[PDB]
Structure formats: structure tokens, C-alpha cells
């Protein structure tokens, strides 16, 4: 049987070879074996002890070789994981996603989720945000959407086509689609080290109709490989890879941000958006419950305005501006700002989110 | 509590760094943490699953970094395992051991044990062989579970040959037995056997290794673990942890680091293929050792492959013991040991000794 401990062992030995003898398609086939093996051991017997040993061995070996940081390997690992995912089937406005890899050791405000909601109230944009709950961070995108008043377990591959028509904003919670990421959930906790799984999230979008996306990465080293990976997983999707120089998987509200355009490169600074810089310690997460209240009451209610130099508001506005600019095919950042500001203060941003919470409520 | 998953993880993280940050002393501490975690292993628990996940990860990462093939790491690994062994206590002739790492993928005749027994028939030599080999000495009429740290001191005074079965001393190696099976890849544990001798009085030893690459680092490791032991590391170019009966063998001489080469021609023997020197299993290997080799049925000149193979390995051990490289003289003493009946008397005395325990 190809779906065996013996087949996984043979893949691990190719990683122990000098130099490593494991191809990108080998990685794909190895991950399917792992996902098969882990789906079947629902116990604390010797078989699950043996399987956990070989899965740990393989993933650790992979991490040490650093082959899991090459575009073609990341691309193939995403493909293998998607084979245990529930994909959304639709019938054929710019549709965008905005999502970071996480793993930057920052506990910043949930700015991707927040920028997705504000973008979704601009005319001609539709936002289909895919995301998860927090691993290393204090507040995740998925933690925020739940405290925002939405029952995310009602949103699945069978219910997204119902929501699709009359929503400018949608949020898809990763673990209700990706049963494969669920199978490796326990062993990832036990390993306590980063593996190939830590960078796959942004590339598991289960809706093929997304046209453009901003993908945040935690390192400069990874960004160019992640740019190439996104080309392979999302062919003919126009996409930004962003890296904040402070070490942030988002457009940084302090110092500069590099953007990989798919390889084209350009730099961003808050001043290009006509905003003051703000320390990350002023843009912190206040936990998911208080984050819901900051987003809903301070930002979405229009309590603060452009020019108030309110850090979190500025931070959400800038990241919204970049999503707009991407959607229109220009780099007029101060125009993106104006369009983001109008989405808040018109009430469009908050209505877009409320229509989503209501549409999910009626399932 | 230092002996925890959190401490082991902190060691794994140093191995993932660029470049690695795990010291040889760090490896010594990680091995004590692994040995602790494994023996206190709550069966059927999520905790068990997690421990095995972390131990597998650390050993795999250590293997991929190749730090487990560096002298100082091998030596610190052996010392960590030895903290869990029974050690033999002896008060106050050259005392030798001969043992390979295994892992050469060969299934040749048990020549280490055979040469140990023949060498123990030569005057001025005492042989305290340590190994895992262990089936052959068992089928020779020998109760190996009566040979332990408590009985070895009684056997010592009046035996020229002794055999110590590793798993009756090295309780540490027992704790990692199961994760080693599950792993199915080589780890640091694969090369520790020769460096866990429980008797500190052993003066000189031949340690065979499976690879040319490991050999030089294994020589330096032996020097760290066995300081003021005169030692030969040996590698058969065919890929053998023994002096090869076919082609060349390289020897790393650590004498308190020198390198020379051996060939059967230098012992006055013909070459033989490994196919012609195969193991017939432990039962028949004992019939062959006792009834054919030790009984004197074969002679220097018959070109009998297994006999030549044993004779050449005894001669290297004799020369090491004597502080010279007169290989042909070593063959003379080996041939004398067999045909005087001294080699067989040495084994018989050990077998009867163990029976009296
Ligand atoms: O490993 P961690 O650092 O905790 O990262 C966790 C989350 O980071 C990403 O946030 P995303 O860009 O979706 O959302 P946000 O900007 O709203 O936080 C992604 O959804 C991960 O689940
Ligand atoms: O390659 P493996 O299957 O792991 O076999 C390895 C064995 O080789 C060694 O034998 P030793 O040199 O002690 O004695 P021998 O020559 O009599 O076999 C050692 O005692 C191991 O148990
Ligand atoms: Mg983000
Ligand atoms: Mg041997």
C-alpha cells in the first residue's frame, strides 16, 4: 500500500541524503501519505505513537533542509493540503482576499480583517476574506469575526454559494473548509516548531473566483519565494506580497514596507498616504472582544476621521487604500485613502458587515 | 522541573538555527532529558504522543545537521547514556575489547566474537568483549543474563575470555529502543554501543565503523570516551565494520592520530568474497566456531574463508596488544592459540564459570 508508514519513511530518507533527494512533487505525495496516516489513527496506541514519530521526523527534516521555503515546494504542499479541503463551487466587481502568513511575533490589531470590511463598502469591490484563529498572536482574524457577532460554523462550502450573491463582504473560517489542516493540528502543537504548515494558510482560498489578493509574509527572505508560490497556486490572479521592515505581515504603520507585485518591487511609507507614523505599541491588539468594539465603535461608526492621527484607524485606512489601489490597477495611495474614508463615514463599511452577519444569522 | 518537553524543545530550536547553536554539552543535557521523558512515559496518553513527537524531532534534526557525526557530540552522547548504565567495579596482561558499530548492511560471520575468543587463548591477553554477537555466545551453552555488573567481578580473576551482553548494562538504550524502531532512520544511538564498555580496566580496543566519513571523528570520540586506551578504528573499503577478507581496510590509530592500510596479502592469506564468509545464523555459527575453527579442523594454508577471516582479525588484535605491526607474527600466535587447544579451553572456562554462578 502506497498510503503507509513505509512510504513516509522512504520520503524522510531522501531528506537525509546529501544533498537532499526530495522533489517538490515528492513533498506533495509525502503530505498526502501524512494526511492519510493521521486521519486513521484516532487513538493513543503504538500505531499512533509510530505514525507521530515518522510525521514529526519528516516535517522536522524538511524544515532543517529549508526546502519548505522554496516556491515550488510551498506550492505543492498547498496543493496536497487542498485535496482534503471542501472547495466552494460557484457559477461564472473586483473580488479580493487580504491575509498574512502570521508568524511575525507581533500582537498587532486585526488590520487585514478590518481593511477587508472597509474595502467591502467601496463601490465595485467584493471582499471574500479567508482566515484562521490566532496561533502565536493574542487575537486572530477568526477570533475577531466571532466576537463581531457572527456564528462562523454556519459558513461552509455548501452555504457560501447562498451568501455569495447579496454580500459585498464574506469571511471564511479556515478550519470549516480545510479538514487536512485539522488532521495535523495536534502534531503541530506537539512539535512546537514552525513547519511548512505555518505558511500555507494564505494559499488555501477555497473560492477560485478571487481575482486579486494582498498576502502578508513574516520575513523578507520568504517574500520572493511566496510571490512565486502565489503565481503557481493562483495563476492569473493579480497579487501583492507585503513585508513591513519592522517584521510585520502587513503594511506597517511605522517605517517602510516592501511590496512584491505579481517580479516587480516598490516601497511604501505612511507619508505616501498622507498619514503620520505610529509605533506598533500604539497599534496593539486589545484581545478579540475589545478589538470587535474598537473596530465597530471607533472605526466603523466613524467616531474618528482622517486627520485625527488615531493610530489603529490610520493603520486600517492605509491597508484599505492599498487593497483599493490594487483593485483599480494604479498606485494613487491618497485616492485609496479618500475611498476608504468615504466607505467608513458613508455607513457603507458597517452596512456591508451587518448584511454579512444577518445573512449568516438566517442559515 | 528541568527534565521537560519545554527544555527538549529549546534544544531542538538551537538545531534549527542558522548555523546550529547546539553545543556538545547541550546534546549531553538533551539526551538526559530524552532518557527521563521516555522512562516516565504515561502509556496511552496525549503526553506520550507529544513526548515521542519532540524526541523524534530532536533526533531527526540532529541527524540532518550531521552534528551527531562529530567527535565531541558522539562522546557527550555516550557519556549521557552511560549515566543510566550499570558499571562494573574491579580492584587495582593487556585487557582488550573488539566491537563494531554495525550499520554496514553486511551479514558476514561473527568475526569480532570469534577473534575475541581466539585472542583470549594467547598468553598475556585478557579479552572482555562487549556487544549486542549476543545470540552466538548464547547458543554456545551460555546463560548471558547471569553475566551482570554484580557477577562480572567474580568471573574476572580466573577467565582469559569474558563476554558482556550490552542490554544487561545499558538501561538508557532500553528506554529509546521503541522510538528507534518507530523512527526507522539512523540516529546518534546507532554508533554508541562500542563506547559504552562498562569495565574501566580495558586497556586497548578495536572499534569497527560502517563509513570512511565517520571513522576519523569516531577515532577522536574514542579518545574522549576512553582516554589512555590505545585504540584502532577499522573500516573495510567494501563497507565493513571489520578488517575485510577482500580488498583493503583503513585503520585509524589513536595512541596516547595515525593512519595506515591493511590487505590480506600482508597476513600471508588469499582474499575471499563476503559471499564466501557469510553468517549461517547463531546456532550453525556456534557449530562452525566450536567444531571447525576452535577444534583445529582448518589450518593456516587451507584457504578456508571464515577461518582466514577470523585469523586475520585475531592477528590485528594481537599486534595492537603488543605495540607493533608484525601482522605475520599475529597470524602465528592466532594459529598457535587454536591448534594448542588454548582458544577452545578459554571459551570452555568462561561457559563453565557462568554455569557455576
Ligand atoms: O500565527 P499568528 O501570528 O497568530 O497568526 C495567526 C493569523 O495571522 C493571519 O491573520 P490575518 O492577516 O488573517 O488577519 P488580521 O490582520 O485581521 O489579524 C492568519 O489568519 C493567521 O491565522
Ligand atoms: O549491523 P547490525 O544489524 O546493527 O549488527 C550490528 C552488530 O554488530 C556488532 O557486532 P560485533 O562487532 O560486536 O560482533 P560480531 O563481529 O561477532 O558480529 C554489534 O554487537 C551489533 O549488535
Ligand atoms: Mg494580517
Ligand atoms: Mg564485528
Q: Could you provide a short overview of the structure?
A:
2 copies of one chain form a homodimer. With 363 residues, chain A is α/β, with parallel strands linked by helices.
Question: What can you see in these coordinates?
Answer:
The structure is a homodimer. By secondary structure, chain A is α/β, with parallel strands linked by helices. Chain A has one domain (94-362): Nucleoside phosphorylase/phosphoribosyltransferase catalytic domain (Pyrimidine Nucleoside Phosphorylase, Chain A, domain 2, 3-Layer(aba) Sandwich). Helices cover 45% and strands 11% of the residues of chain A. The first copy, chain A, is built from 14 helices and 7 strands. The first copy, chain A, has helices at residues 5-16, 24-40, 46-65, 71-82, 111-119, 141-147, 160-163, 179-183, 185-191, 222-233, 288-299, 311-328, 333-345, 348-361; strands at 94-100, 125-131, 169-173, 212-216, 238-244, 257-261, 264-268. In chain A, strands 3-2-1-4-5-6-7 form a 7-stranded mixed sheet, with helices on both faces. In chain A, α4 packs across α10 (222-233) and α12 crosses α13 (333-345). Chain A is globular, with a radius of gyration of 20 Å. The termini of chain A are far apart. Chain A binds chain B through residues 5, 9, 12-13, 15-16, 44-46, 48-50, 52-54, 56-57, 59-61, 63-65, 186-187, 189-193, and chain B through 5, 9, 12-13, 15-16, 44-46, 48-50, 52-54, 56-57, 60-61, 63-65, 178-179, 181-186. Residues 99-100, 102-103, 110-113, 131-133, 193 of chain B line the site of one 1-O-pyrophosphono-5-O-phosphono-alpha-D-ribofuranose. Chain A: It catalyses: N-(5-phospho-beta-D-ribosyl)anthranilate + diphosphate = 5-phospho-alpha-D-ribose 1-diphosphate + anthranilate. Chain A: It comes from Saccharomyces cerevisiae (strain ATCC 204508 / S288c) (Baker's yeast). Chain A: Its cofactor is Mg(2+). Chain A: 5-phospho-alpha-D-ribose 1-diphosphate binds at residues 100, 110, 112-113, 133, 135, 137. Chain A: GO terms for molecular function: anthranilate phosphoribosyltransferase activity.
Amino acid at each position: 500500500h502506497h498510503m503507509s508508514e513505509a512510504t513516509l519513511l522512504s520520503y524522510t530518507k531522501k531528506l537525509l541524503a546529501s544533498p537532499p533527494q526530495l522533489s517538490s512533487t515528492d513533498l506533495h505525495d509525502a503530505l498526502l501519505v501524512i494526511l492519510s496516516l493521521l486521519q486513521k489513527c484516532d487513538t493513543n496506541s503504538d500505531e499512533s505513537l509510530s505514525i507521530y514519530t515518522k510525521v514529526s521526523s519528516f516535517l522536522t527534516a524538511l524544515r532543517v533542509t529549508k526546502l519548505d521555503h522554496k516556491a515550488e515546494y510551498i506550492a505543492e504542499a498547498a496543493k496536497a493540503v487542498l485535496r482534503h479541503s471542501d472547495l466552494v463551487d460557484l457559477p461564472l466587481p473586483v473580488i479580493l482576499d487580504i491575509v498574512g502568513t502570521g508568524g511575525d511575533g507581533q500582537n498587532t490589531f486585526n488590520v487585514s480583517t478590518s481593511a477587508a470590511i472597509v474595502a467591502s463598502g467601496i463601490q465595485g469591490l467584493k471582499i471574500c476574506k479567508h482566515g484562521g484563529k490566532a496561533s502565536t498572536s493574542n487575537s486572530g482574524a477568526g477570533d475577531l469575526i466571532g466576537t463581531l457577532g457572527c456564528d462562523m460554523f454556519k459558513v461552509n462550502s455548501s452555504t457560501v454559494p447562498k451568501l455569495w450573491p447579496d454580500n459585498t463582504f464574506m469571511f471564511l473560517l479556515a478550519p470549516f473548509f480545510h479538514h487536512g489542516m485539522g488532521h495535523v493540528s495536534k502534531i503541530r502543537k506537539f512539535l512546537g516548531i514552525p513547519t511548512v504548515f505555518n505558511v500555507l494558510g494564505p494559499l488555501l482560498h477555497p473560492v477560485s473566483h478571487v481575482n486579486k489578493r494582498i498576502l502578508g509574509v513574516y520575513s523578507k527572505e520568504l517574500a520572493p519565494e511566496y510571490a512565486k508560490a502565489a503565481a503557481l497556486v493562483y495563476p492569473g490572479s493579480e497579487t501583492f506580497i507585503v513585508w513591513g521592515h519592522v517584521g510585520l505581515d502587513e503594511v506597517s504603520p511605522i517605517g517602510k514596507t516592501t511590496v512584491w507585485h505579481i517580479l516587480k518591487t516598490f516601497q511604501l511609507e505612511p507619508s505616501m498616504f498622507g498619514l503620520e507614523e505610529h509605533e506598533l505599541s500604539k497599534c496593539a491588539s486589545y484581545g478579540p472582544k475589545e478589538n470587535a468594539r474598537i473596530l465597530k465603535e471607533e472605526v466603523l461608526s466613524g467616531k474618528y476621521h482622517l486627520g485625527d492621527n488615531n493610530p489603529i484607524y490610520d493603520y486600517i485606512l492605509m491597508n484599505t487604500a492599498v487593497l483599493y489601489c490594487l483593485s483599480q490597477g494604479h498606485q494613487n495611495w491618497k485616492e485609496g485613502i479618500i475611498k476608504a474614508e468615504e466607505s467608513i463615514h458613508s455607513g457603507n463599511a458597517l452596512r456591508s458587515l451587518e448584511h454579512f452577519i444577518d445573512s449568516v444569522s438566517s442559515l
